[PDB]
Amino acid sequence: VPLRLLLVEDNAADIFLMEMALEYSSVHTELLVARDGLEALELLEQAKTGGPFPDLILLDLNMPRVDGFELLQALRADPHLAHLPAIVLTTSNDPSDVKRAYALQANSYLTKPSTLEDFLQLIERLTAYWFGTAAIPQTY
Amino acid sequence: VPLRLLLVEDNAADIFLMEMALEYSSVHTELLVARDGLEALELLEQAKTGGPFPDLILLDLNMPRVDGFELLQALRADPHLAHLPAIVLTTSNDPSDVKRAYALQANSYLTKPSTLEDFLQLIERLTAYWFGTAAIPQTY
Ligand SMILES: [Ca+2]
Ligand SMILES: [Ca+2]
Ligand SMILES: [Ca+2]
Ligand SMILES: [Ca+2]
Ligand SMILES: [Ca+2]
């Protein structure tokens, strides 16, 4: 059974980097992609009625149509989505951005680091924590 | 500034185990203790008017007076506390407990292991993630 990670990201290069970094993780992962918060809510809408939710959502803040703050609001307002772990992964390290993400009930916040090496290491640590150390809701 | 961890815990043996595990953790931590959900909310009330919020709150589900689910509800209902990272640390591995913790906007859920080796490791990974890998709200 792969663990399903829903990545919400508008920039193709960030998706490519995530898919390459997940290959190095040594936790069996399947990447789902939404290009903005509107695609993410449509994908989650289908998961309700249909088959499996993602185990984890990673979202960027600055995305067209439905941005990350708007997606966090919508996740926490929907009683069928409120339990989904939602982690911000974004290039902003602005304290005001991190406080607001946490106030909108993001589970965690990760700054995209400044080297490829540190990005690969971040994805290894994200996956070791959320998919190894921590318990997360079952997709069942 | 040490990183301040607020443990909501009445059991002296669990406080001893946490103190012992944090000694071995590579990360400079200061442990604050509240004996139940009601002491925790009073300490946080004083943080508003007075000095610093904790960087992270660790709570169990089964606690006298104000249980963990009720403490999470009270943290998220108070706009001055909603942003505080709150992690359930409990011996329950019931999937319905983990789903409910996440639905009430706990940031994470950690199952207390049954061996000293795995407990020390759990606390090392908790602290490396929340106080190293992740960004959390600043306290000052
Ligand atoms: Ca973006
Ligand atoms: Ca918008
Ligand atoms: Ca939260
Ligand atoms: Ca959440
Ligand atoms: Ca306890």
Short mmCIF file of C-alpha atoms and ligand atoms in Angstrom, two decimals:
data_model
loop_
_atom_site.label_atom_id
_atom_site.label_comp_id
_atom_site.label_asym_id
_atom_site.label_seq_id
_atom_site.Cartn_x
_atom_site.Cartn_y
_atom_site.Cartn_z
CA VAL A 1 0.00 0.00 0.00
CA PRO A 2 1.75 3.30 -0.99
CA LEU A 3 1.30 6.27 1.35
CA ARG A 4 -0.40 9.00 -0.74
CA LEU A 5 1.09 12.49 -0.54
CA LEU A 6 -1.04 15.29 -2.14
CA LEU A 7 1.36 18.06 -3.21
CA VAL A 8 -0.41 21.41 -3.98
CA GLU A 9 2.12 23.42 -5.99
CA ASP A 10 1.81 25.71 -9.07
CA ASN A 11 5.51 25.52 -10.20
CA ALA A 12 6.34 22.39 -12.29
CA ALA A 13 10.04 22.46 -11.17
CA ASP A 14 8.97 22.18 -7.46
CA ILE A 15 6.78 19.14 -8.39
CA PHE A 16 9.70 17.56 -10.32
CA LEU A 17 12.04 18.17 -7.33
CA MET A 18 9.44 16.61 -4.95
CA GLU A 19 8.98 13.50 -7.18
CA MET A 20 12.78 13.03 -7.40
CA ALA A 21 13.25 13.62 -3.61
CA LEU A 22 10.45 11.07 -2.79
CA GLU A 23 12.39 8.38 -4.76
CA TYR A 24 15.26 8.84 -2.18
CA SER A 25 12.91 8.63 0.91
CA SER A 26 12.82 4.78 1.48
CA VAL A 27 9.18 5.13 2.61
CA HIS A 28 6.95 3.76 -0.27
CA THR A 29 5.15 6.97 -1.43
CA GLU A 30 2.70 7.83 -4.24
CA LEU A 31 2.63 11.54 -5.29
CA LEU A 32 -0.74 13.16 -6.17
CA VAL A 33 -0.47 16.69 -7.64
CA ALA A 34 -2.86 19.64 -7.56
CA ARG A 35 -1.68 22.88 -9.25
CA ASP A 36 -3.74 25.13 -6.89
CA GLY A 37 -6.20 25.07 -4.01
CA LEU A 38 -9.18 24.71 -6.41
CA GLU A 39 -7.72 21.48 -7.99
CA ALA A 40 -6.88 20.29 -4.39
CA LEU A 41 -10.53 20.79 -3.16
CA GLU A 42 -11.89 19.03 -6.33
CA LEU A 43 -9.53 16.03 -5.77
CA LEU A 44 -10.54 15.89 -2.05
CA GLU A 45 -14.29 16.21 -3.04
CA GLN A 46 -13.87 12.97 -5.13
CA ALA A 47 -12.03 11.22 -2.29
CA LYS A 48 -15.06 11.85 0.02
CA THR A 49 -17.65 9.93 -2.07
CA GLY A 50 -15.05 7.66 -3.81
CA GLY A 51 -11.84 5.81 -2.79
CA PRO A 52 -8.83 6.87 -0.64
CA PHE A 53 -7.98 10.28 0.90
CA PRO A 54 -4.32 11.29 0.80
CA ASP A 55 -2.36 10.47 4.00
CA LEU A 56 -0.81 13.98 3.93
CA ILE A 57 -1.26 17.33 2.08
CA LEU A 58 1.77 19.56 1.34
CA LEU A 59 0.76 23.03 0.11
CA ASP A 60 2.50 26.20 -1.08
CA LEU A 61 1.13 29.64 0.04
CA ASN A 62 1.32 31.68 -3.21
CA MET A 63 -0.81 29.81 -5.82
CA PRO A 64 -3.36 31.11 -8.32
CA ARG A 65 -7.18 31.09 -7.71
CA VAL A 66 -7.10 29.31 -4.31
CA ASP A 67 -3.88 30.13 -2.40
CA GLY A 68 -2.52 28.18 0.60
CA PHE A 69 -4.23 30.30 3.31
CA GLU A 70 -7.57 29.83 1.45
CA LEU A 71 -6.97 26.07 1.13
CA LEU A 72 -6.20 25.76 4.90
CA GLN A 73 -9.46 27.71 5.65
CA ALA A 74 -11.43 25.36 3.36
CA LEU A 75 -9.84 22.17 4.79
CA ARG A 76 -10.63 23.15 8.41
CA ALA A 77 -14.18 24.44 7.56
CA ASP A 78 -15.16 21.07 5.96
CA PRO A 79 -15.87 18.49 8.71
CA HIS A 80 -14.98 15.62 6.25
CA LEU A 81 -11.51 17.21 5.52
CA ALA A 82 -10.63 18.80 8.96
CA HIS A 83 -8.60 15.73 10.09
CA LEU A 84 -6.29 15.65 6.99
CA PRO A 85 -2.71 16.58 8.01
CA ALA A 86 -1.87 19.77 6.07
CA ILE A 87 1.72 21.00 6.00
CA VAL A 88 2.82 24.24 4.40
CA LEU A 89 5.95 23.85 2.22
CA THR A 90 6.82 27.31 0.87
CA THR A 91 9.84 29.59 0.12
CA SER A 92 8.58 32.30 2.64
CA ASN A 93 10.27 32.19 6.14
CA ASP A 94 8.21 35.31 7.15
CA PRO A 95 7.17 34.84 10.84
CA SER A 96 3.78 36.49 9.99
CA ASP A 97 3.23 33.76 7.30
CA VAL A 98 4.14 30.96 9.77
CA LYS A 99 1.93 32.33 12.58
CA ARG A 100 -1.03 32.73 10.16
CA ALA A 101 -0.58 29.18 8.72
CA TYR A 102 -0.62 27.76 12.31
CA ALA A 103 -3.64 30.03 13.25
CA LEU A 104 -5.51 28.54 10.22
CA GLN A 105 -4.72 25.07 11.74
CA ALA A 106 -1.94 23.89 9.42
CA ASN A 107 -0.31 20.88 11.17
CA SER A 108 3.21 22.19 10.36
CA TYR A 109 5.26 24.62 8.24
CA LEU A 110 8.46 23.85 6.26
CA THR A 111 10.56 26.48 4.47
CA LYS A 112 11.95 25.32 1.07
CA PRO A 113 15.69 25.42 1.77
CA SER A 114 18.32 27.24 -0.28
CA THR A 115 20.33 24.17 -1.57
CA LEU A 116 19.26 21.01 -3.46
CA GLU A 117 21.13 18.91 -0.80
CA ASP A 118 19.07 20.53 2.05
CA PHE A 119 15.83 20.06 0.04
CA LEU A 120 16.52 16.26 -0.42
CA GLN A 121 17.30 16.06 3.35
CA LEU A 122 14.07 18.00 4.21
CA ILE A 123 11.90 15.53 2.22
CA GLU A 124 13.72 12.56 3.89
CA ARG A 125 12.99 14.11 7.34
CA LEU A 126 9.37 15.16 6.50
CA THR A 127 8.58 11.57 5.37
CA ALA A 128 10.52 9.89 8.28
CA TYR A 129 8.47 12.06 10.75
CA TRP A 130 4.92 12.04 9.23
CA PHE A 131 5.13 8.46 7.83
CA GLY A 132 7.37 6.81 10.52
CA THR A 133 7.59 8.66 13.90
CA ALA A 134 4.09 10.25 13.99
CA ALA A 135 0.68 8.59 13.84
CA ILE A 136 -1.61 10.13 11.18
CA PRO A 137 -5.28 9.30 10.42
CA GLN A 138 -5.89 6.04 8.54
CA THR A 139 -7.24 6.17 4.95
CA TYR A 140 -9.95 3.49 5.56
CA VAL B 1 16.32 31.46 24.99
CA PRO B 2 15.83 27.67 25.44
CA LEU B 3 12.95 26.19 23.39
CA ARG B 4 10.03 25.88 25.88
CA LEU B 5 8.03 22.66 25.83
CA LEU B 6 4.78 22.76 27.89
CA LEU B 7 3.99 19.18 29.04
CA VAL B 8 0.42 18.71 30.34
CA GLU B 9 0.94 15.69 32.60
CA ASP B 10 -0.13 14.71 36.18
CA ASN B 11 1.89 11.42 36.42
CA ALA B 12 5.29 11.94 38.10
CA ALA B 13 6.76 8.84 36.38
CA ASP B 14 5.82 10.28 32.92
CA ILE B 15 7.38 13.64 33.93
CA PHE B 16 10.55 11.75 35.05
CA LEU B 17 10.65 9.81 31.71
CA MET B 18 10.19 13.06 29.70
CA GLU B 19 12.93 14.80 31.76
CA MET B 20 15.28 11.85 31.19
CA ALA B 21 14.55 11.70 27.41
CA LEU B 22 15.05 15.51 26.99
CA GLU B 23 18.47 15.23 28.78
CA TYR B 24 19.64 12.86 25.97
CA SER B 25 18.01 14.94 23.18
CA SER B 26 20.60 16.97 21.16
CA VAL B 27 18.31 20.11 21.27
CA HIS B 28 18.43 22.78 24.11
CA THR B 29 14.95 22.43 25.68
CA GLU B 30 13.27 23.85 28.83
CA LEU B 31 10.39 21.70 30.21
CA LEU B 32 7.37 23.54 31.70
CA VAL B 33 4.73 21.31 33.39
CA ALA B 34 0.99 21.81 33.92
CA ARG B 35 -0.90 19.05 35.88
CA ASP B 36 -4.13 19.16 33.74
CA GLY B 37 -5.99 21.06 30.98
CA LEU B 38 -7.22 23.70 33.46
CA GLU B 39 -3.68 24.51 34.84
CA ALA B 40 -2.42 24.59 31.16
CA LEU B 41 -5.09 27.19 30.12
CA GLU B 42 -4.32 29.31 33.29
CA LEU B 43 -0.56 29.29 32.48
CA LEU B 44 -1.36 30.30 28.83
CA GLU B 45 -3.79 33.05 30.11
CA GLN B 46 -0.79 34.55 32.03
CA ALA B 47 1.47 34.24 28.97
CA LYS B 48 -0.95 36.64 27.14
CA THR B 49 -0.66 39.51 29.70
CA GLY B 50 2.83 38.47 31.02
CA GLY B 51 5.96 36.75 29.54
CA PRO B 52 6.51 34.10 26.77
CA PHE B 53 4.19 31.43 25.22
CA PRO B 54 5.66 27.91 24.97
CA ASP B 55 7.07 26.86 21.55
CA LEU B 56 5.12 23.56 21.77
CA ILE B 57 2.40 21.94 23.99
CA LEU B 58 2.45 18.15 24.60
CA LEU B 59 -0.73 16.68 26.10
CA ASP B 60 -2.26 13.27 26.82
CA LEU B 61 -5.94 12.43 26.03
CA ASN B 62 -6.86 11.01 29.52
CA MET B 63 -6.27 13.86 32.05
CA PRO B 64 -8.38 15.00 35.03
CA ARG B 65 -10.93 17.90 34.76
CA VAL B 66 -9.99 19.02 31.21
CA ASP B 67 -9.07 16.00 28.99
CA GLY B 68 -6.92 16.28 25.82
CA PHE B 69 -9.83 16.56 23.34
CA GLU B 70 -11.32 19.39 25.52
CA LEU B 71 -7.90 21.11 25.79
CA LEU B 72 -7.47 21.02 21.97
CA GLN B 73 -11.04 22.49 21.60
CA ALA B 74 -10.14 25.30 24.08
CA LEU B 75 -6.78 26.07 22.37
CA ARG B 76 -8.43 26.34 18.91
CA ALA B 77 -11.48 28.32 20.22
CA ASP B 78 -9.17 31.01 21.75
CA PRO B 79 -7.87 33.21 18.89
CA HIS B 80 -4.77 34.15 21.05
CA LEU B 81 -3.87 30.41 21.50
CA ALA B 82 -5.09 28.88 18.15
CA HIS B 83 -1.59 29.11 16.55
CA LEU B 84 0.24 27.22 19.39
CA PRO B 85 1.57 23.84 18.20
CA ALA B 86 -0.23 21.14 20.23
CA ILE B 87 0.87 17.49 20.03
CA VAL B 88 -0.93 14.55 21.57
CA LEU B 89 1.49 12.14 23.29
CA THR B 90 -0.50 9.15 24.55
CA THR B 91 -0.29 5.33 24.98
CA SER B 92 -3.57 4.96 22.88
CA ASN B 93 -2.92 3.81 19.24
CA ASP B 94 -6.75 3.69 18.63
CA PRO B 95 -7.28 5.01 15.04
CA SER B 96 -10.52 6.75 16.20
CA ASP B 97 -8.43 8.65 18.86
CA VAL B 98 -5.89 9.74 16.21
CA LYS B 99 -8.60 10.80 13.74
CA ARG B 100 -10.43 12.81 16.45
CA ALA B 101 -7.19 14.50 17.67
CA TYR B 102 -6.46 15.61 14.05
CA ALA B 103 -10.14 16.70 13.52
CA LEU B 104 -9.87 18.90 16.66
CA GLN B 105 -6.72 20.47 15.04
CA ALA B 106 -3.92 18.84 17.07
CA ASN B 107 -0.73 19.51 15.05
CA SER B 108 0.40 15.86 15.51
CA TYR B 109 -0.08 12.62 17.44
CA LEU B 110 2.69 10.45 18.97
CA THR B 111 2.10 7.02 20.54
CA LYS B 112 4.23 6.52 23.69
CA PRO B 113 6.26 3.35 23.03
CA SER B 114 6.65 0.56 25.59
CA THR B 115 10.54 0.35 25.60
CA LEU B 116 13.00 2.94 27.00
CA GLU B 117 15.07 2.68 23.76
CA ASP B 118 12.04 3.57 21.55
CA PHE B 119 10.87 6.29 23.98
CA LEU B 120 14.27 8.11 23.95
CA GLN B 121 14.24 7.84 20.13
CA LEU B 122 10.65 9.18 19.89
CA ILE B 123 11.51 12.28 21.99
CA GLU B 124 14.75 12.85 19.96
CA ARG B 125 12.70 12.75 16.70
CA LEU B 126 9.88 14.94 18.12
CA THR B 127 12.45 17.63 19.13
CA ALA B 128 14.59 17.33 15.93
CA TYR B 129 11.40 17.75 13.83
CA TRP B 130 9.49 20.52 15.72
CA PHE B 131 12.67 22.41 16.84
CA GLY B 132 14.92 21.77 13.77
CA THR B 133 13.17 20.63 10.54
CA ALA B 134 9.87 22.56 10.96
CA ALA B 135 9.29 26.27 11.45
CA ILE B 136 6.91 26.97 14.37
CA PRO B 137 5.51 30.34 15.56
CA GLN B 138 8.02 32.59 17.37
CA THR B 139 7.30 33.25 21.10
CA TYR B 140 9.78 35.94 22.34
CA CA C 1 3.89 29.19 -5.72
CA CA C 2 -8.39 33.46 -4.16
CA CA C 3 -3.26 23.11 14.92
CA CA C 4 -4.66 20.66 11.07
CA CA C 5 0.27 10.63 31.45
#
